[PDB]
Design an enzyme around this catalytic site. Structure first.
Site, mmCIF file in Angstrom:
data_model
loop_
_atom_site.group_PDB
_atom_site.id
_atom_site.type_symbol
_atom_site.label_atom_id
_atom_site.label_comp_id
_atom_site.label_asym_id
_atom_site.label_seq_id
_atom_site.Cartn_x
_atom_site.Cartn_y
_atom_site.Cartn_z
ATOM 1 N N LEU A 22 -19.604 0.547 37.390
ATOM 2 C CA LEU A 22 -18.841 1.557 38.001
ATOM 3 C C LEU A 22 -19.735 2.785 37.989
ATOM 4 O O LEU A 22 -20.434 3.335 37.151
ATOM 5 C CB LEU A 22 -17.676 1.571 37.635
ATOM 6 N N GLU A 30 -6.464 3.244 34.785
ATOM 7 C CA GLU A 30 -7.054 2.716 36.211
ATOM 8 C C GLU A 30 -7.269 1.015 35.692
ATOM 9 O O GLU A 30 -6.888 0.233 36.399
ATOM 10 C CB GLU A 30 -8.272 3.450 36.499
HETATM 11 N N1 NAP Z 1 -14.985 -0.486 42.043
HETATM 12 C C1 NAP Z 1 -14.778 -1.597 42.259
HETATM 13 O O1 NAP Z 1 -13.303 -2.009 42.470
HETATM 14 C C2 NAP Z 1 -15.480 -2.626 41.977
HETATM 15 C C3 NAP Z 1 -15.142 -4.306 41.909
HETATM 16 C C4 NAP Z 1 -16.198 -5.187 41.784
HETATM 17 C C5 NAP Z 1 -17.600 -4.909 41.443
HETATM 18 N N2 NAP Z 1 -17.827 -3.316 41.462
HETATM 19 C C6 NAP Z 1 -19.524 -3.177 41.226
HETATM 20 O O2 NAP Z 1 -20.160 -3.592 42.365
HETATM 21 C C7 NAP Z 1 -21.316 -3.923 41.864
HETATM 22 C C8 NAP Z 1 -21.414 -5.312 42.240
HETATM 23 O O3 NAP Z 1 -21.214 -5.675 43.594
HETATM 24 P P1 NAP Z 1 -22.214 -6.374 44.511
HETATM 25 O O4 NAP Z 1 -21.705 -6.234 45.898
HETATM 26 O O5 NAP Z 1 -23.414 -5.603 44.284
HETATM 27 O O6 NAP Z 1 -22.362 -7.920 44.137
HETATM 28 P P2 NAP Z 1 -21.552 -9.038 44.100
HETATM 29 O O7 NAP Z 1 -20.746 -9.406 45.541
HETATM 30 O O8 NAP Z 1 -20.488 -9.028 42.751
HETATM 31 O O9 NAP Z 1 -22.711 -10.301 43.717
HETATM 32 C C9 NAP Z 1 -23.508 -10.733 45.019
HETATM 33 C C10 NAP Z 1 -23.704 -12.148 45.002
HETATM 34 O O10 NAP Z 1 -22.994 -12.740 44.770
HETATM 35 C C11 NAP Z 1 -22.812 -14.037 45.568
HETATM 36 N N3 NAP Z 1 -22.025 -14.055 46.685
HETATM 37 C C12 NAP Z 1 -21.471 -12.709 47.143
HETATM 38 N N4 NAP Z 1 -20.643 -12.921 48.009
HETATM 39 C C13 NAP Z 1 -20.813 -14.190 48.280
HETATM 40 C C14 NAP Z 1 -20.284 -15.347 49.509
HETATM 41 N N5 NAP Z 1 -19.460 -14.803 50.520
HETATM 42 N N6 NAP Z 1 -20.597 -16.511 49.386
HETATM 43 C C15 NAP Z 1 -21.400 -16.815 48.557
HETATM 44 N N7 NAP Z 1 -21.922 -16.297 47.421
HETATM 45 C C16 NAP Z 1 -21.305 -15.096 47.659
HETATM 46 C C17 NAP Z 1 -24.507 -14.098 45.823
HETATM 47 O O11 NAP Z 1 -25.225 -14.449 44.835
HETATM 48 P P3 NAP Z 1 -26.471 -15.315 44.859
HETATM 49 O O12 NAP Z 1 -27.588 -14.484 45.424
HETATM 50 O O13 NAP Z 1 -26.582 -16.322 43.835
HETATM 51 O O14 NAP Z 1 -26.213 -16.359 46.047
HETATM 52 C C18 NAP Z 1 -24.770 -12.666 46.150
HETATM 53 O O15 NAP Z 1 -25.926 -12.072 45.587
HETATM 54 C C19 NAP Z 1 -21.449 -3.409 40.301
HETATM 55 O O16 NAP Z 1 -21.758 -2.226 40.455
HETATM 56 C C20 NAP Z 1 -20.135 -3.537 40.095
HETATM 57 O O17 NAP Z 1 -19.697 -2.704 39.000
HETATM 58 C C21 NAP Z 1 -16.849 -2.336 41.581
#
Ligand code: NAP
Ligand code: CA
Length: 186
Positions: A22, A30
């Site tokens: 985050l 939160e």
């Molecule tokens: N502020 C908040 O509420 C909050 C909530 C969550 C996360 N975060 C932050 O966000 C970051 C992680 O988020 P991100 O967007 O970078 O990653 P992510 O969505 O958590 O990870 C993405 C991976 O997940 C799989 N994936 C994602 N969407 C998919 C779909 N529709 N179908 C199939 N596979 C899917 C794929 O993996 P493969 O490459 O293996 O296919 C894609 O590379 C971190 O910084 C975390 O701290 C914040």
């Protein structure tokens, strides 16, 4: 399924992460909001299901996985088997939805919550299903490298009130934020 729920916290630019974590240091209040909202089921002997991408799952401290008291589902086009600790692995949102409707899950699951990241949120957003979005707007600018998809203000209407969601501007650790609820009706 009937309807999805999405929960996210965003800073001013709609950023949701930075470097795999985050953008802000920890806010106690939160946090508890997240646990409380995601974990609480309105039906006895039912459990809630959380859906998240791979990067998010791994963002969780290992000894803290899977999120206690919920069915953890991870999405990944690459993993073969569910990461150690997850309950189910799915290849797309669709697969996830379908798994949920299955006999064994059908009955064990109350509410479905989308916990990110970007692509998960986006995917859920576009499904023409009833959906409620719980947003925490953190009124500050922290640098982020990951962002919340653009929301269709024509589809998602901002509720003026909702049960058990303070409406006033909150503050903690010198930062203020507000809780907002948007609702999409199909
Ligand atoms: N502020 C908040 O509420 C909050 C909530 C969550 C996360 N975060 C932050 O966000 C970051 C992680 O988020 P991100 O967007 O970078 O990653 P992510 O969505 O958590 O990870 C993405 C991976 O997940 C799989 N994936 C994602 N969407 C998919 C779909 N529709 N179908 C199939 N596979 C899917 C794929 O993996 P493969 O490459 O293996 O296919 C894609 O590379 C971190 O910084 C975390 O701290 C914040
Ligand atoms: Ca990849």
């Amino acid at each position: 399924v009937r309807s999805l729920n999405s929960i996210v916290a965003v800073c001013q630019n709609m950023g949701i992460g930075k470097d795999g974590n985050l953008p802000w240091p920890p806010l106690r209040n939160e946090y508890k909001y997240f646990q409380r909202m995601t974990s609480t089921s309105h039906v006895e002997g039912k459990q809630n299901a959380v859906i998240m991408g791979k990067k998010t799952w791994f963002s969780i401290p290992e000894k803290n996985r899977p999120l206690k008291d919920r069915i953890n589902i991870v999405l990944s086009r690459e993993l073969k088997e569910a990461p150690k600790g997850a309950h189910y692995l799915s290849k797309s949102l669709d697969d996830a939805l379908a798994l949920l409707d299955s006999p064994e899950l059908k009955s064990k699951v109350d509410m479905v919550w989308i916990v990110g990241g970007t692509a998960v949120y986006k995917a859920a957003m576009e499904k023409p299903i009833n959906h409620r979005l719980f947003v925490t707007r953190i009124l500050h600018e922290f640098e982020s490298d990951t962002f919340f998809p653009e929301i269709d203000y024509k589809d998602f209407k901002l509720l003026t009130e909702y049960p058990g969601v303070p409406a006033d501007i909150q503050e903690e650790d010198g930062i203020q934020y507000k809780f907002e609820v948007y609702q999409k009706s199909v």
